[PDB]
Ligand binder design. Structure first.
Ligand SMILES: Nc1ncnc2c1ncn2[C@@H]1O[C@H](COP(=O)(O)OP(=O)(O)OP(=O)(O)O)[C@@H](O)[C@H]1O
Ligand SMILES: Nc1ncnc2c1ncn2[C@@H]1O[C@H](COP(=O)(O)OP(=O)(O)OP(=O)(O)O)[C@@H](O)[C@H]1O
Ligand SMILES: Nc1ncnc2c1ncn2[C@@H]1O[C@H](COP(=O)(O)OP(=O)(O)O)[C@@H](O)[C@H]1O
Ligand SMILES: [Mg+2]
Ligand SMILES: [Mg+2]
Lengths: 99, 587, 100
């Protein structure tokens, strides 16, 4: 379904509200692949979310929402779900989930 | 108060600039809130209600009221701040910054002295990055914190009840679901904002029909939010197809394409179908005129709104002998009402002969294996709220199955081991049995019998079956069943009809290999004569058909006499008991 | 006749005269099927407590054999379901003002 949505967006059969929007599939594990030092995972996630906010014309796709609850949790590491919760509740980010 | 502003949200300022949804018809709970907040003990209020009723909307309306200055001087000059836990968690991973920023926040809170805090989703703060729970509890124990909380009823009873320390400091306020006029009022209030956002226009008829459709044909979600969802969804549909206008059939079809296939129209064409229901059913079921008539009458009465909306859409006890059409009628009903046989949820009760198997019906108790998975029936009903539930051979199950099953008959809702509630109001319940038909299956009576074998039939058989079943079953269970339908054994003439249907099935099996079969009237009469048995009724006919046709047809196929692209004509030879079948292959 | 008798009995039982060791009232309804027995009980409960849910109705047909009798009076320790009490007792715990 998301594949066909991307094909429709690139081909040009979408309403004018979307037109040229970029579907980016998130890649978990790559975010965690190097988060060993002080401030590595939270900073990466905040940076990517801020870049999405700055661009504006980006929409995210998560292929497994059940894996989102607990990604880089540690002695601290509030985790990715808590980071995503506030601005998702504020309605300033558009994401499509698949489970 | 830089720390306070960084880690808090002002509802009063937002109300001043009107960033909040309007509230109407909800002053009771806010009046209760400052009713209980003015006490000396248990001054901290907690709003208990089902999710979506608007507890957040409750505190938003409280902020609106305090901004409007409609509250006595006790609550005046008090700044309301919702504690933005997202602000606390965000950016806080320094080894010690967490709970220490909270220390600054709380010390500023007590220092200011004219402040009020709001805590939404109190479960994360009480009875739950985790040590923050242990800080607020002593603060409320001391008693100088005036906070307003909000919590779901099940969570409140499961977790907030056991916190004996805060039992003497919290007071509960219940919030009930809004009535349909209240929903209409809220829809009217949100009309302006939603029309401005969607750049469309909506009418009052759309509002009332959306509210009614949400109340009647949706059960998982709840009224004060799902009507808003439907109108926003319709507005999005009108926005994406291009001043736009939204009418009733528009939201009707949006709901139809949203969740399942609820009503899919409001015209009279489906009503004409319900007028032709008996003729439609008789294309799969042959000879059971009384059963089809009673079922059609009951479901037509249900469709007319003359039944209790709380109760399910129909309850039938199909009592009869073996192989008469008890399951074929259920399959035909499933095909007619929902377009496919897959809509029928069949449960063979022969696997529920032991009481401890009841756990597999609606899950296992907590703490045991298999708890993470739900019940095999409750979850399946939740997936498809519009389905026909069949309990095949209901008499072979343990009586605890009946104990659990009656609840569906009374209140149409079931609670599983996980505490969730599933609604059975949009389903048809059929329970099949062979009990009470021992005298109908065979009977000659003792003594000389006159010419007869024809009586009032349906009425006397129904009364006898009902009294026998209430002798064997619980009388209240039979009393609450919508209808008890007795299936008489098949006659001879209708058998000659059934043959045709069965032959058609065989023809389908020959369509895969590019073949076909045709029979003469004499062959059909011979098949009906050979396959007639008034005690069993239909399966012996199938055995006779298989033996006399497809045996000696498979042999011809294997031998090579019949090839793809051919038709097998079947006729009869001989007379009387010497009659036999003859097969001839042609192009 | 039955309504008058029940009214007189309720007057006896609610005048403060009979011993508190006795319950609120004890009645045996005998009659055929399809007559106003269950309806009369429901009306009595509705009048006394202002609600139709103030009626704990139990069928003794469920307890033909004694193995289920304890199910109505709390499970003794050591059973599969001992953590859950009997049906009759916990309903009185939830509401002592009801018609059994
Ligand atoms: N009136 C009928 N019209 C058409 N087919 C029928 C009729 N009665 C029986 N059959 C067919 O004969 C067989 C009888 O099976 P069916 O499911 O109807 O039995 P049943 O009445 O549920 O009996 P039981 O479950 O007690 O064995 C099926 O192949 C069914 O299609
Ligand atoms: N005396 C009555 N006055 C009014 N309605 C009555 C009366 N008797 C019966 N009915 C009606 O018939 C229904 C069945 O009566 P009810 O349930 O009281 O019977 P019952 O004799 O207590 O039951 P059963 O003997 O079958 O266990 C009632 O719900 C009511 O609608
Ligand atoms: N009294 C009301 N006035 C206006 N809108 C309401 C009211 N009650 C509920 N709503 C609407 O219902 C929606 C969901 O309510 P929500 O704030 O989620 O309640 P809760 O947080 O308790 O689940 C909100 O968007 C709100 O607009
Ligand atoms: Mg069957
Ligand atoms: Mg009775």
């Amino acid at each position: 379904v998301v594949e066909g949505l991307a094909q429709a967006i690139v081909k040009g059969e979408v309403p004018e509200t979307l037109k040229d929007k970029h579907l980016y599939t998130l890649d978990l594990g790559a975010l965690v692949a190097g988060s060993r030092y002080r401030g590595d995972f939270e900073e990466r996630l905040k940076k990517v979310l801020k870049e999405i906010r700055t661009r504006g014309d980006i929409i995210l796709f998560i292929d497994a929402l059940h894996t989102l609850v607990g990604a880089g949790a540690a002695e601290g590491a509030i985790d990715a779900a808590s980071i995503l919760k506030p601005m998702l509740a504020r309605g300033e980010l558009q994401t499509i989930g698949a489970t | 108060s830089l720390v306070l502003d960084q880690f808090g949200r002002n509802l009063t300022q937002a109300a001043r600039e009107s960033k909040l949804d309007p509230v109407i018809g909800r002053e009771k709970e806010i009046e209760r809130v400052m009713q209980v907040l003015s006490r000396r003990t248990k001054n901290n209020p907690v709003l208990i209600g089902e999710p979506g009723v608007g507890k957040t909307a409750v505190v938003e309306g409280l902020a609106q009221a305090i901004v409007k200055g409609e509250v006595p001087e006790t609550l005046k000059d008090k700044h309301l701040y919702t504690l933005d836990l997202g602000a606390l968690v965000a950016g806080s991973r320094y080894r010690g910054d967490f709970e220490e920023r909270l220390k600054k926040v709380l010390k500023e809170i007590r220092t200011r002295g004219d402040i009020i805090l709001f805590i939404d989703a109190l479960h994360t703060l009480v009875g739950a990055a985790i040590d923050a729970a242990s800080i607020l509890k002593p603060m409320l124990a001391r008693g100088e914190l005036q906070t307003i909380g909000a919590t779901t009823l099940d969570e409140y009873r499961k977790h907030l009840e056991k916190d004996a320390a805060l039992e003497r400091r919290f007071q509960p306020i219940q919030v009930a679901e809004p009535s349909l006029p209240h929903t209409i009022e809220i829809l009217k209030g949100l009309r302006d904002r939603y029309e401005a956002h969607h750049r469309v226009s909506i009418t009052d008829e759309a509002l009332v029909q959306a509210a009614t459709l949400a109340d009647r044909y949706i059960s998982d979600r709840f009224l004060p939010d799902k009507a808003i969802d439907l109108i926003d969804e319709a507005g999005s549909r009108m926005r994406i197809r291009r001043v736009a206008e939204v009418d009733g059939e528009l939201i009707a079809e949006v709901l139809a394409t949203a969740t399942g296939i609820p009503v899919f129209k409001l015209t009279e064409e489906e009503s004409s179908r319900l007028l032709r229901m008996e003729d439609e059913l008789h294309k799969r079921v042959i000879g059971q005129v009384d059963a089809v008539k009673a079922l059609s009458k009951a479901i037509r009465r249900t469709r007319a709104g003359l039944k209790d909306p709380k109760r399910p859409g129909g309850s039938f006890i199909f009592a009869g002998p073996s192989g008469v059409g008890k399951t074929e009628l259920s399959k035909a009903l499933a095909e007619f009402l929902f377009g496919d046989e897959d809509a029928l949820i069949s449960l063979d009760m022969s696997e529920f002969s032991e009481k401890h198997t009841v756990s597999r019906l609606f899950g296992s108790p907590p703490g045991y294996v298999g708890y993470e998975e739900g019940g095999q029936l409750t979850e399946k009903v939740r997936r498809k709220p519009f389905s026909v539930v069949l309990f095949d051979a209901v008499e072979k199950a343990h009586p605890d199955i009946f104990n659990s099953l009656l609840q569906i008959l009374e209140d149409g809702r079931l609670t599983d081991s996980q505490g969730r509630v599933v609604d059975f109001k949009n389903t048809v319940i059929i329970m099949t049995t062979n009990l009470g038909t021992r005298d109908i299956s065979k009977g000659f009576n003792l003594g000389f019998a006159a010419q007869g074998d024809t009586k009032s039939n349906y009425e006397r058989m129904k009364n006898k079956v009902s009294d026998e079943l209430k002798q064997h079953f619980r009388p209240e269970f039979l009393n609450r069943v919508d209808d008890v339908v007795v299936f008489p054994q098949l006659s001879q003439a209708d058998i000659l009809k059934i043959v045709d249907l069965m032959i058609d099935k065989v023809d389908e099996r020959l369509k895969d290999r590019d073949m076909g079969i045709e029979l003469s009237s004499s062959a059909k009469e011979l098949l009906s004569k050979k396959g007639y048995d008034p005690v069993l009724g239909a399966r012996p006919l199938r055995r006779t058909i298989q033996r006399e046709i497809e045996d000696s047809l498979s042999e011809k196929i294997l031998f090579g006499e019949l090839r793809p692209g051919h038709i097998v004509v079947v006729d009869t030879e001989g007379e009387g008991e010497t009659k036999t079948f003859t097969f001839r292959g042609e192009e």
